[PDB]
Symmetry: T
Subunit: 150 residues, 12 copies
């Protein structure tokens, strides 16, 4: 129960971020309009599944550690730090810029936890290190759209 409790808490934070993340991901998928919006749909779909699956992993890891994971809407806002995605019906430029911002928080938060799990739980850390690869790759695809010349 020693450090496991502490790790379990770190994961809960991650759990709420993922839930909030795939909800948001879906939200923009539904509200993006404009010329190149099919490409955005194409790009979001797989990420939504990846993140949803990461929520399952993170959640099942919290339970394996001994605590009870929370996935209800209330727990999402309680844990939440990143306000609430506020861009609605809009273009690819607006939603991508906003999403890039969302990922800065997600990636930065994931890096810290990986750093914090170094001496608590290698397994749980490896879990986060695997997620960071896709989280960061995705942000790049997002950024790549906002570069009409680079």
């Amino acid at each position: 129960d020693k450090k496991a409790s502490d790790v379990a808490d770190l994961l809960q934070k991650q759990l709420s971020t993922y839930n909030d993340l795939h909800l948001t991901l879906k939200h923009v998928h539904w509200n993006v309009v404009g010329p190149n919006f099919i490409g955005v749909h194409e790009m979001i779909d797989p990420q939504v599944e990846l993140v949803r699956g990461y929520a399952d992993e993170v959640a099942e890891r919290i339970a394996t550690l001994g605590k009870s994971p929370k996935g209800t809407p209330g727990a999402i806002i309680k844990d939440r730090t990143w306000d609430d995605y506020s861009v609605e019906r809009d273009t690819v430029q607006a939603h991508l810029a906003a999403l890039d911002l969302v990922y800065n928080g997600v990636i930065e938060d994931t890096r810290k936890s990986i750093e914090k799990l170094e001496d608590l739980d290698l397994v749980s850390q490896d879990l986060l290190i695997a997620h960071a690869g896709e989280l960061e790759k995705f942000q790049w695809f997002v950024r790549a759209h906002l570069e009409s010349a680079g």
Copy 2:
């Protein structure tokens, strides 16, 4: 814009209920313990996908009608009427009883909308009528567990 606006609103309610629903569904999947918890996992998994897909349908129907659908956590609690699933680490009996309750609201709410869409939009109604079939069947599987003799 006439009645479409009104239909679009009815759907938004449904959209938030579904989002809250698959989040909750997942929450119990993660927190159910006890002897017959594998059967509960088995039963929940497909429902989580069905409901998630219904969220996409309902959401894409709101946009098709002309309004902007909301899937962020904030919109879920704003629209929300059914509090916030409060059963955590627990047995199959407790979670199923709670879920049966959750579905009473979901099914009852879906029936009204189907009733209200009768003279507004047959298509959107057919969408809800298709969902009601699975929503109700699922509740029965849930109830079936709580019947150790019937």
Copy 3:
């Protein structure tokens, strides 16, 4: 069969609308060019699939009703629906704008046949109710690419 004759007549118009539709749909696929034409390709492919399928259902339903379904080119330009598609090799917006109007008539015609079937054949009605949803959803995606005039 008297009402069966009417219903069949109604479906025949729908059939010809569907045939002209997938011919037209494919026509644009082969003629859309521009920086984002591929997004439109990936949008049309499954719609052609669906509409070719809908034509089969309507044709088979008509036969089921005891009438001979007509699918020859002469039959199509007779029942007709819209001016023989006049956009050749052109931009994405030029094509999508045209497509939008083509879908306005399809959806309107579908809406009317559904009302007329209300008191004639619940099964044939159900067929169009099912069709309307995807037909409307598709226009939506076409319109999503368009966003001018404020």
Copy 4:
């Protein structure tokens, strides 16, 4: 509940029809001979699975409505209002003709249930309305065979 018992009762009549139907579908499959029985084999197979699935759908709908669905041979006999299918080893013509008559009842009974369910249960009605389309479509393929 008192309006749902009415829906459960209809459905059980519908459930027994499906069971007797997919058994009969297999029976004709096993006994059709003649130059083109192969095609009738192909035509019946997917229908058998469709109807076997429809039986499942209705039985589950009955249990959802709080009643106990009946699927034993005895249940079929009790509910059955028609005569046991009586064609044995025979021509494609003979079976397809008998089957045409069978689907006349199946379809007529389904429409009457779709008609009653109208003011009782729109969800249960939707279930049958969906079935109807397939049952009637299948009867056409049976009939197309009969028009030499």
Copy 5:
């Protein structure tokens, strides 16, 4: 031919058993409730398809032997020597117990046919010997449930 009519007759008794069996399998599927009915759902499904397939195998074997296989509800009643399955909405315990008894007969009847076919038709015998393995294997899973 006079030794093949004997094989066709056995098989028809076997064919009616399978039909009554896969109908009953579905029936219990539709009526099991309780904490662990989900598993019994999973356990019955593949068995249902296996038995539905076995019915097909036997019916075709009968037609191959020159006789007309019977698969209608009426055929089942005529051939049936057992009582219609009588358990309705009930516990997993109740159905699995009733089913255990059902498979006792199914298996006993199959061995007697495997025993007669010995000197009548080795190919038909091989068909049943193959079925037996699955029928008995399935009865064990039913029984494993009963040993609390």
Copy 6:
């Protein structure tokens, strides 16, 4: 591109032949009846698939050559090829006999375009050489159903 213009012209005729062909092919599918009609169903289904595919290849080739491919109903009845199919609900032989003649023209026209392409475009020629094989093989199966007049 001068020869490219000719080649493209040649393909356009082929395209319209293919469009009329799968429309016609499907027309008979919906109208064949008789004791062995299903054998004809199973014969036509993959042929419609193939011909719809061939039209796509020819259309894309034409575009590849710098021309705008035409696939509208008006385009089809203009280039035309055979009298608008005139067999409605009829027997298998009645339909197959008609189909046979329709294929005589297709195959003949293909044979000629292949000769003309001999010295213009080996790639477009190769496309028709490939098409001819299945087109001819199909007529064969149609004729196999027919065997009268000794």
Copy 7:
């Protein structure tokens, strides 16, 4: 080497019958014409694969026993007893009648071997007993065509 040699010989006979069988099967597939010839194709195809596979089994069993199996054309006629299928371009009635005859020999020959292997090799016998099931079922489908009333 004792009885294995004898069993190995019995199998070689079977091997040549199978090879001759799938060749013949294919021959009629190619030469059957008439109304219901699609059904015959449909029926033959799977049998051709089954029999071809039985040739592999029987052949690999001969090698496993210690002898060298022969699949060349010469070995087929040497072992052959049933002349050489002599029906060419022809109808379903003619080819089926001929095939029924071919199977009488095949089935009768298979029964004897099963009978002869009873005290030589149970495994090799089980192999033949499995084949007999399909060989006999197939003959029935063949006979079923020649019964326009039964």
Copy 8:
């Protein structure tokens, strides 16, 4: 009937060579022993299917042309020119050397026919040109085994 008759004859020759070929192919598959015999099995299997399929193509092309194709064992030896594979239980070296020889005849014979079909039937020629690619590639894999240094 003019040249088609002549082409039909050329194909029959090819048909018998293929039949004899896949029989032989299978024969060596069953009789190859030694260290690297798995690789030989691996290599033969796909060729056996390819060649069997080529027999179907060639055969269906003969019928499409108007003649009756022959696949019975008798026709194989009548048409046959290449004696009868005489290597039995043996090593990879022996069987491969023999097979290389078999293919020299097959490839050389195929080249002539392609050459002879140049002014008779382009379609039938294309059929043979497609086969030659695989026939020749296969011979190379065979030769590659007999090169323990090259």
Copy 9:
């Protein structure tokens, strides 16, 4: 159940033979080296699959008979069958020779259990009859790699 006890006893020996077999089979897979070791890999993989499957059948049959099947390591070295496999990292022939002898005992033991079951349980017998065929076929392939001493 008296005979059921004997039969079960018989199967238990078979079970342990199968467990030692797939453990041993996998042992060599990991230790075979040499120029043609991969051919042996591809040979063993499906055999391990099959034998692991056979163990499941025998185990389940034993339970079906009312006995407790034993699959622990202690159970295996008790019933035993052959000297704990003693070939480590070695050549292909060294391993295959050893494998050959291991299969001689398996096949012999199977042959005996099949005779003993003759008058006890036709179903359990049928199970081994089925197993014997693949077990023997596998030895064959092992022996095919070997061909020394004339």
Copy 10:
């Protein structure tokens, strides 16, 4: 290779733990009975799959390191880990309780090898880090079935 020798040694213990593990895992599968035994079946099947796979990875890694991996029964009971599984035909809780303890040792041993590998081989460490996650997740599911003593 000195450290490579140590690492290999470490993996060999892991290998034997994995072999005993899937043998034991399968042992219980065949011996679990009770009202909810099937839930345990469906829980064990993929775990056996995984553990058999892990053994292959560890075995191949050991060989990759230049050592001979040992997978014989004698090797397993030598390295050993826990008392030869002693629960035969028994209840679900009786089996799962035992399984729980077996997994405590596996996970602990894995945890230690991962620490020891920290400074010897990052790749072999990564292998166990990957294994630990599923091994621990599985214990979790086993423990989820258990919930006594408050």
Copy 11:
């Protein structure tokens, strides 16, 4: 043999083109940015596999013709007559324009080989004629992007 060495030589030039092509295809895939790079991603992927497969087809054809096919980076440089693709992170417009020019050469070189092979090897020619169709089809999709 002396007429086959000519075919092997052509093909090696063709083999080096394909290798440099599927490497370049991946390179543009990795460096396209802008509003619609996703589509260009989708468009390039299947082409990459097609060309990687074509490289295989030609290399095997060369070995079949008795020569040793060359596929190392050094082989590419030796055979290469064009300049290394030089566009880095850049707009879809920039890469698709550069690629259009690349396929101009690829297609022109393929037709000249199809033209020589005419009297040398009809089978090898058939191989390239098949490739050409895909290479030219792909160049059209590249160009359709350029016509704003």
Copy 12:
């Protein structure tokens, strides 16, 4: 950013290794002859796809880190520190021996990068650590061939 440019640089060296590697893998595939070249064919195929995929993974990682990944033949030559693979049509023994030496460098270079990335980028390191396992596993199968 100044610590990420270091990671991007390493990776580009790694990216050029993979490209030269999957080209070379294909090259040996095309030129192995002898009694058991078929197996070496099977062994190389999945490795080729694995390495082609790894090239993609690294290139994308470089673009994610803000740099432009280089995949053209010229890029390979520039980064390449080893000699172009020089074995032509030759025995399985000859290629597998040469390949063993090739993977010695590939693996040694990958460990040094895994070692540097330790304090630079744990995510990029994780990427290579994953690759290493496959690269080393593949080198063992190459070596197992060499131990006659």
